[PDB]
Amino acid sequence: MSTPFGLDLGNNNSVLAVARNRGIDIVVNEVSNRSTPSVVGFGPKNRYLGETGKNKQTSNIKNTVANLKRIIGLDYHHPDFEQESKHFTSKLVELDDKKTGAEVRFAGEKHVFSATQLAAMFIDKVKDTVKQDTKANITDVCIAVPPWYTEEQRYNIADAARIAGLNPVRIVNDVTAAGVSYGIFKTDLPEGEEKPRIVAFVDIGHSSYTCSIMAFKKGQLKVLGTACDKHFGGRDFDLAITEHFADEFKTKYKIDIRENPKAYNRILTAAEKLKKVLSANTNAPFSVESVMNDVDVSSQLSREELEELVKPLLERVTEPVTKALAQAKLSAEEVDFVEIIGGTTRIPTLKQSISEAFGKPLSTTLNQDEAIAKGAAFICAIHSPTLRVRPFKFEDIHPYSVSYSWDKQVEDEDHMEVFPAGSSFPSTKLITLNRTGDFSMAASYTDITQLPPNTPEQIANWEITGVQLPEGQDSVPVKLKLRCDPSGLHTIEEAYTIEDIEVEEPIPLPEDAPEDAEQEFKKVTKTVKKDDLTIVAHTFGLDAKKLNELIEKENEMLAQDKLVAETEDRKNTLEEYIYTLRGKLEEEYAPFASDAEKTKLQGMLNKAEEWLYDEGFDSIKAKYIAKYEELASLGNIIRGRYLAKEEEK
Amino acid sequence: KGPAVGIDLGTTYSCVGVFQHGKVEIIANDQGNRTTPSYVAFTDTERLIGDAAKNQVAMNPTNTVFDAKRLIGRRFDDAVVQSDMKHWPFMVVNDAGRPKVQVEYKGETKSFYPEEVSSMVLTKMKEIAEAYLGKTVTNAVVTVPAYFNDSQRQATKDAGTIAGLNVLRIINEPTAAAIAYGLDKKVGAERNVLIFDLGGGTFDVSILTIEDGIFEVKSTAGDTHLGGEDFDNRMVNHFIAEFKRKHKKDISENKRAVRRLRTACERAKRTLSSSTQASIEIDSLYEGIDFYTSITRARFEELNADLFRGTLDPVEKALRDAKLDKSQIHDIVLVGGSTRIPKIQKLLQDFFNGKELNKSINPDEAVAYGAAVQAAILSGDKDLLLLDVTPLSLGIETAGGVMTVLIKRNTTIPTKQTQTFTTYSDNQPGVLIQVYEGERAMTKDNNLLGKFELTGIPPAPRGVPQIEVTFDIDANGILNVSAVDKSTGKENKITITNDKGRLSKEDIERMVQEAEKYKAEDEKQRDKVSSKNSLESYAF
Ligand SMILES: Nc1ncnc2c1ncn2[C@@H]1O[C@H](COP(=O)(O)OP(=O)(O)O)[C@@H](O)[C@H]1O
Ligand SMILES: Nc1ncnc2c1ncn2[C@@H]1O[C@H](COP(=O)(O)OP(=O)(O)O)[C@@H](O)[C@H]1O
Ligand code: BEF
Ligand SMILES: [Cl-]
Ligand SMILES: [Cl-]
Ligand SMILES: [Cl-]
Ligand SMILES: [Mg+2]
Ligand SMILES: [Mg+2]
């Protein structure tokens, strides 16, 4: 009896939702915000995870890691690494796997963490965020990612979930999670037998722009076309401006802010804040204290100037809308509504620039911050063994053609296209292979020139074991079950041998009644499962060994944090006990404590007071309950002869 | 096309909810904000409502109107309006007996009544509703504090209609909140309920009496200027202590540095309701200096010992004025974001002796919640999405090692099932109830979850006695299995110590299939035995 948790792992901030009390609620965190910041940062005694990490952004700038979701599966030498690190702040380094990772000063030492392991860190925090709000148990997770994520990164971010000890029931394309939101709430979608409603969804968030068009009917969405600009989000606007001011403070100030980390960074943060402000007002003041050489900066920006700045971005906007309709084999007037979600769709010029990209008004009927997450948790619920969900069918788009190959034994061919381009997923395909024995299979892209530069082409491979020939047979048909799963992942779900046998059945003839006699039987061949075969999968997923490894580090790092915080709890139970004791020696215990008894403490509180000011400002958990002990010795006693003496007396 | 929204017109921030899908949805504004500020700001070009207005305050302070709620439907020479005219950096004229606020809209002079300011706030709340909902919005339930008098209570319904709303009904803030938690739907008797509304700058205790869902407003106590913003102040003060000390510089003259130290304390405050420590780190606070410090929660609760504890006062003065004792309040309800302060709850709960506090619903917006429920009820209400169910067939063991199911797998939860059993041998003293989970027909392929005994059945002939097992699951999935003797009334039960943690839908589906692969020989095993009945504590 544990709760479905869907997580919307956005580049700037995540939104946690849970399915419960027959609906889907959002979970608020420790600082009462409805979205945690997707930041992992590292102290000298603990980790700063989620909400805390952001505070430290300016102190801990060097051991603060954000952009979590973009370094997942990022090849260290990728021709675009530039575009990602552009936005970083901690140093990124290559790993054994040629993949990207982070160097951070943490628990005294240098440490190096992989994007998978960093992402596992954040997910653990929010898992906890939800654990505490639910008071209940948390295991299954459905996570939302950009549709652009590769079959690799889908695996990685899933393995992340595993390190932070959640089992990933599904990796879902985010805007499709918003589609499920839409589908399961809106109330008079067309009937199955009617033409469906075509709704385009546009999500410009912190770093990624995505536009996908879907067809809805009661209980049903099918995704018709999706097209992304993964280098177009709020963060690109934040620079655009930050750069304009950088020029000014070269002029009427002459500091090249592009000379200081701490400086550039505080202007950035302030650019962001200003921008949000011009989404509601036409003019906005701008000022940062002591940028460099004890200099104070002061300027402003008008909406008109803001927009004038971003014309470059405002011109990359229609590109994916065209690409989307083009793929969905649709024309723009066939799209009934266009719903905007995503933080940076709040900028009015952008609102318009997309309206004129579809040539109709925008609609805003989803909660445009919680829809990807809310829908994601519904999906998680689907996979809940303890829930019966409203029936809802959704098929996403499977853009690239994928074939499967196999040991050409007795078979004419050793491969075939299995999941065509533009088909939906999930999809299961049954094949039957003729087998002289054990064999190997592999899945890969049919035309590697269709995929983004430097995409491997090989996707996964399996080995099938335990093939065993009937008796006198030279070969054996094994039925395989190739499956493109609900996370988009290309698998082989099940494989077994089959064999014919003869099942003697009786022949009727109850027409005549010929003295009751002449019962005939016919041998009948019945094809039947023979043996179940064994599949070892070799995928981008991590092996049980390296998994438990990554898991034991998250297990330690986590429990060093859980001590670091379990300690400062006592430092408080003490401190609180100190105040509440002096404050009752007068307000309740004066009539109830002795007089010589009062100078026993008073008193003893006072050493235990300034105690908390050097030894220890930060002592050890041992001593924070140590002092609490002997202070409580003198408590109770008094406190009690009071309580049993007024309670009944 | 035309639905029923519920609006909380509050002093500084208004909220707007709509009831769709069994629960209330709270609508966000086109800036992401669930609550919207009650500010209108006039300027030259055009006017500005909500965030737009509150953004450009301090660049129009003498033209950005607010707190119009503090004078809607009242007389210029009023007891409380006199005290009020003080802060508002805008002009408050008189147009024959009543108050009227006066401004620079388009450069010169114009003046609007309170109901007019408040009405152009609802207009935005209307708008905000209309955006999200798709169609247009006309019917609304608007809320007001229990202590409103018919004149201001009326001027509120005017704001409504001036704003093109069809104000279905005006209702109490305290009663809206009790609505949300649906106490006006709890089994008979007469109910006493205390709302404990601690905003960011207003406090309000109210005691209501409900019979048959009719709201009788017993008494109101409170404090006009008490909330969040106050506990903030203590911190700010306290930290200027610290900064002035640790640095010889005193910041108190810095309208920006004091602001930044303020923002930081509010954040820390919020942190301190969840953690026991918090941290303040303003890069370059004053004269290029960096302020980085911490603050403990006990230290926080200490700066406000006087303030917190003092919230207990309008409680006693409401408990009294309403002629009731502390133990006659059946339900307490936290409302407003300051009620999240562990200590304030700690104080309130103990005062009422460990009694539980209704606070599931974000207090930030409990009221708007209640109002959105009402506008439903008042408009005809304007399958199930999610259902809790059972993972595995539950049952007991029967003569043979058979599994006799009481609750079929995938049964809709809150459930009760009962099947009469009998005895296996004669003069059988007692039965052994063994509870099994699994989908196999033989308890040897299923999982034992627990066992207990019914003993002291009147000895009788093999087959007579009417033992009567019942499986009970509450909403939480707790399982009580109980056997009762029809004959005597002798009864024993057990509450299965659960274990859940766990099996995932795959696991079940693989379990379900094993049981389909053996249907044949499983079925032909209890299809050779014949009897549904339990054996004398003869386990196995
Ligand atoms: N009112 C607003 N106006 C303009 N931009 C905004 C507004 N609110 C948020 N944003 C921007 O949108 C981004 C966050 O949107 P979100 O979609 O949550 O990001 P992600 O989903 O990638 O985590 C931030 O960069 C923020 O600056
Ligand atoms: N977790 C929390 N702990 C303590 N105070 C909080 C918390 N969340 C919000 N607050 C405080 O509640 C105040 C506002 O809450 P609310 O009831 O909505 O009244 P308002 O209408 O003034 O916003 C703010 O001053 C804020 O500091
Ligand atoms: F998650 Be966001 F919408 F990119
Ligand atoms: Cl009662
Ligand atoms: Cl004060
Ligand atoms: Cl809450
Ligand atoms: Mg994003
Ligand atoms: Mg109020």
Contact A11, A17 (CB under 8 A): no
State how far the Cα of A368 lies from the Cα of A311, in Å rounded to an integer. Answer: 24
State how far the Cα of B80 lies from the Cα of B70, in Å rounded to an integer. Answer: 9
| Cβ-based neighbour number of residue B77 at 10 Å | 11
Question: Can you tell me whether residue B170 is helix, strand or coil?
Answer: strand
For chains A and B, CB pairs below 8 A equal 160
Residue A278 Cα, gap to closest chain B Cα (Å): 9
For B51, the token pair is: 């965030």
For B184, the token pair is: 């006006």
For A498-554, the DSSP string reads EEEEE--EEE---SS--SS---EEE--EEEEEEEE-EEEEE-SSPPHHHHHHHHHHH
Furthest-apart CA atoms within chain A: distance in Å: 119
Q: What's the CATH number for B66-112?
A: 3.30.30.30
Contacts of B530 (CB under 8 A, 6+ apart): none
Q: Which of residues 307-346 of B touch A (CB under 8 A)?
A: 337, 340
Burial of A96 (0-12, 13-18, 19+ CB in 10 A): exposed
State how far the Cα of A598 lies from the Cα of A48, in Å rounded to an integer. Answer: 43
Contact B447, B437 (CB under 8 A): yes
DSSP A252: S
- Pocket lining: B112 vs ligand 2, CB cutoff 6 Å: no
Class at the top of the CATH hierarchy for domain B186-226+305-363: alpha beta
Ligand 3, pocket-test mutation among A35, A70, A203, A235, most atoms within 8 A of CB: A203
State how far the Cα of A28 lies from the Cα of A14, in Å rounded to an integer. Answer: 11
| Cβ-based neighbour number of residue A279 at 10 Å | 23
Buried b (16+ CB within 10 A) or exposed e, B144-174: bbbbbeeebbebbbbbbebbebebbbbbbbb
Integer CA distances (angstroms), B184 to A320, B188, B192, B251, B379, in order: 52, 9, 11, 52, 18
Nearest to A69 by CA among A174, A178, A197, A189: A174
State how far the Cα of A162 lies from the Cα of A379, in Å rounded to an integer. Answer: 18
User: What are the domain boundaries of chain B?
Assistant: 1-65+113-185+364-381, 66-112, 186-226+305-363, 227-304, 392-540
Q: Which helix (H) or strand (E) holds A177?
A: helix A174-185
State how far the Cα of B21 lies from the Cα of A396, in Å rounded to an integer. Answer: 26
State how far the Cα of B152 lies from the Cα of B114, in Å rounded to an integer. Answer: 10
Supply the angle between the helices A151-163 and A544-585 in degrees, to the nearest 10. Answer: 40
- Pocket lining: B335 vs ligand 2, CB cutoff 6 Å: no
Contact B394, B406 (CB under 8 A): yes
Cβ-defined contact of A30 to B274 (cutoff 8 Å): yes
Question: Is B173 assigned a catalytic role?
Answer: yes
Class at the top of the CATH hierarchy for domain A1-38+115-186+364-389: alpha beta
In this structure, which amino acid lies at residue A340?
I
Nearest to A134 by CA among B189, B250, B476: B476
State how far the Cα of B245 lies from the Cα of B242, in Å rounded to an integer. Answer: 5
Q: What's the CATH number for B227-304?
A: 3.90.640.10
Question: Is B388 assigned a catalytic role?
Answer: no
Contact A448, A400 (CB under 8 A): no
Nearest to A572 among B22, B298, B384 (CB): B298
SS3 content of chain B, % helix, strand, coil (to 5): 30, 30, 40
Contact A37, A53 (CB under 8 A): yes
Fold (topology level) of B392-540: Substrate Binding Domain Of DNAk; Chain A, domain 1 (2.60.34)
Integer CA distances (angstroms), B320 to A257, B324, B332, B345, B350, in order: 64, 6, 16, 21, 18
Contact A313, A382 (CB under 8 A): no
Cα B228 off chain centre by: 19
Nearest to A352 by CA among A343, A344, A361: A361
Strands A476-484 and A490-502: antiparallel
Burial of B499 (0-12, 13-18, 19+ CB in 10 A): exposed
Contacts of A289 (CB under 8 A, 6+ apart): A296, B256, B284, B288
For A400, the token pair is: 């690239």
- Pocket lining: B36 vs ligand 2, CB cutoff 6 Å: no
State how far the Cα of A267 lies from the Cα of A287, in Å rounded to an integer. Answer: 9
Nearest to A205 by CA among A182, A228, A180: A228
State how far the Cα of A234 lies from the Cα of A13, in Å rounded to an integer. Answer: 12
State how far the Cα of B540 lies from the Cα of B522, in Å rounded to an integer. Answer: 17
State how far the Cα of A96 lies from the Cα of A94, in Å rounded to an integer. Answer: 7
Q: Which helix (H) or strand (E) holds B520?
A: helix B505-526
State how far the Cα of B38 lies from the Cα of B50, in Å rounded to an integer. Answer: 6
Contacts of A619 (CB under 8 A, 6+ apart): A571
Catalytic residue among B127, B184, B197, B364: B197
Q: Which residues of B touch A285 (CB under 8 A)?
A: 59
Location of structure tokens 């399915």: A19
Report the sign of the C-alpha dihedral through residues B366, B371, B372, B374, in that order: positive
For A561, the token pair is: 């944090």
Question: Can you tell me whether residue A365 is helix, strand or coil?
Answer: coil
Q: Which helix (H) or strand (E) holds B453?
A: strand B447-455
Cβ-defined contact of B505 to A383 (cutoff 8 Å): yes
Task: Determine the straight-line distance between the first and last CA of chain A, rounded to whole angstroms.
Answer: 47
State how far the Cα of A369 lies from the Cα of A390, in Å rounded to an integer. Answer: 23
State how far the Cα of B184 lies from the Cα of B214, in Å rounded to an integer. Answer: 7
State how far the Cα of B300 lies from the Cα of B325, in Å rounded to an integer. Answer: 32
Q: List strand residue ranges (DSSP E) for A75-219, in order.
A: 91-94, 100-106, 109-114, 140-145, 167-173, 197-204, 209-217
Q: What's the CATH number for A39-114?
A: 3.30.30.30
Cβ-defined contact of A385 to B297 (cutoff 8 Å): no
A119 phi, psi to nearest 5 deg: -70, -25
- Pocket lining: A140 vs ligand 3, CB cutoff 6 Å: no
Whats the size of chain A, residue-wise?
649
Nearest to B32 by CA among A340, A9, A68: A340
Location of structure tokens 């098929």: A395
User: In CATH, what is the architecture of B1-65+113-185+364-381?
Assistant: 2-Layer Sandwich (3.30)
In this structure, which amino acid lies at residue B533?
N
- Listed in sequence order, the DSSP H helices in B216-341 are 229-247, 257-271, 297-303, 305-309, 312-321
Cα A434 off chain centre by: 42
Q: How was this structure determined?
A: X-ray
Integer CA distances (angstroms), A434 to A409, A479, A482, B124, in order: 7, 9, 16, 70
Nearest to A202 by CA among A276, A155, A147: A147
Nearest to A373 by CA among A126, A45, A561, A39: A126
Contacts of A240 (CB under 8 A, 6+ apart): A309, A310, A312, A313
User: What are the domain boundaries of chain A?
Assistant: 1-38+115-186+364-389, 39-114, 187-232+317-363+390-400, 233-316, 401-541, 542-649
Cα B456 off chain centre by: 49
Task: Determine the straight-line distance between the first and last CA of chain B, rounded to whole angstroms.
Answer: 65
State how far the Cα of A51 lies from the Cα of A34, in Å rounded to an integer. Answer: 11
For B471, the token pair is: 């499986």
State how far the Cα of B435 lies from the Cα of B447, in Å rounded to an integer. Answer: 9
Cβ-defined contact of B270 to A390 (cutoff 8 Å): no
Question: Is B505 assigned a catalytic role?
Answer: no
State how far the Cα of A393 lies from the Cα of A109, in Å rounded to an integer. Answer: 50
State how far the Cα of B113 lies from the Cα of B68, in Å rounded to an integer. Answer: 9
Nearest to B363 by CA among B348, B384, B376: B348
Q: Give the ligand 1 atom nearest the CA of A12.
A: 23
Which ligand lies nearest to the CA atom of residue A31 in the structure? Answer: 2
DSSP B169: E
> Strand pairing partners for A145?
A173
Nearest residue in A to B131, CA atom: A364
| Cβ-based neighbour number of residue A579 at 10 Å | 16
Strands B166-172 and B139-144: parallel
Q: Which of residues 237-256 of B touch A (CB under 8 A)?
A: 256
State how far the Cα of B115 lies from the Cα of B124, in Å rounded to an integer. Answer: 14
Nearest to B410 among A381, A388, A572 (CB): A388
Question: Is B197 assigned a catalytic role?
Answer: yes
A354 phi, psi to nearest 5 deg: -90, -35
Angle of CA points A323, A326, A330, to nearest 5°: 135
For A430-476, the DSSP string reads EEEEEESS-EEEEEEES-GGGS-TT--SEEEEEEEE-----SS-S-E
Contact B163, B123 (CB under 8 A): yes
A122 phi, psi to nearest 5 deg: -65, -55
Catalytic residue among B173, B204, B331, B439: B173
For A82, the token pair is: 């530039």
Contact A123, A109 (CB under 8 A): no
The protein residue with its alpha carbon nearest to ligand 2, atom 23, reads: B200
Which ligand lies nearest to the CA atom of residue B270 in the structure? Answer: 2
User: In CATH, what is the architecture of A542-649?
Assistant: Up-down Bundle (1.20)
A448 phi, psi to nearest 5 deg: -60, -15
- Pocket lining: A233 vs ligand 3, CB cutoff 6 Å: no
DSSP A195: P
Cα B15 off chain centre by: 15
State how far the Cα of A148 lies from the Cα of A151, in Å rounded to an integer. Answer: 9
Nearest residue in B to A348, CA atom: B30
DSSP B382: -
Cα B298 off chain centre by: 26
Q: Which helix (H) or strand (E) holds A168?
A: strand A167-173
State how far the Cα of A493 lies from the Cα of A485, in Å rounded to an integer. Answer: 9
Nearest to A345 by CA among A201, A182, A529: A201
Integer CA distances (angstroms), A265 to A14, A77, A284, A445, B183, in order: 22, 26, 20, 42, 51
* Reported resolution, Å: 3.1
Report the sign of the C-alpha dihedral through residues A499, A501, A505, A507, in that order: positive
Location of structure tokens 């809320």: B143
> Strand pairing partners for A482?
A429, A492
Contacts of B141 (CB under 8 A, 6+ apart): B4, B5, B6, B7, B167, B168, B169, B170, B171, B371, B372, B374, B375, B378
State how far the Cα of B178 lies from the Cα of B167, in Å rounded to an integer. Answer: 20
Q: Would you tell me which CATH number, out of the four given (3.40.50.150, 3.30.565.10, 3.30.420.40, 3.90.78.10), belongs to the domain A187-232+317-363+390-400?
A: 3.30.420.40
Nearest to A2 among B59, B386, B502 (CB): B502
Contact B512, B519 (CB under 8 A): no
Residues of B annotated in the binding site, as ranges? 10-13, 69, 200-202, 266-273, 337-340
- Pocket lining: A344 vs ligand 1, CB cutoff 6 Å: yes
State how far the Cα of B95 lies from the Cα of A23, in Å rounded to an integer. Answer: 52
Nearest to A43 by CA among A22, A19, A63: A63
> Strand pairing partners for A431?
A480
DSSP A412: S
Q: Is B538 on the interface with A (CB under 8 A)?
A: no
Integer CA distances (angstroms), B532 to B302, B470, B504, in order: 67, 15, 32
Contact B191, B283 (CB under 8 A): no
Q: What's the CATH number for A233-316?
A: 3.90.640.10
Whats the size of chain B, residue-wise?
540
Contacts of A500 (CB under 8 A, 6+ apart): A525, A526, A527, A528
State how far the Cα of B373 lies from the Cα of B4, in Å rounded to an integer. Answer: 9
For B196, the token pair is: 């404990």
Burial of B519 (0-12, 13-18, 19+ CB in 10 A): exposed
State how far the Cα of A630 lies from the Cα of B4, in Å rounded to an integer. Answer: 61
Q: Does domain A401-541 have CATH number 2.60.34.10?
A: yes
State how far the Cα of A210 lies from the Cα of A230, in Å rounded to an integer. Answer: 8
Q: Which helix (H) or strand (E) holds A284?
A: strand A283-288
What residues are neighbours of ligand 4 (ion), with CB under 5 Å? B 189
- Pocket lining: A12 vs ligand 1, CB cutoff 6 Å: yes
| Cβ-based neighbour number of residue B481 at 10 Å | 24
DSSP B3: -
Cβ-defined contact of A139 to B55 (cutoff 8 Å): no
Residues of B annotated in the binding site for ATP, as ranges? 10-13, 69, 200-202, 266-273, 337-340
Three-state SS string across A368-403, please?
A: CCCHHHHHHHHHHHHCCCCEEECCCEEEEEECCCEE
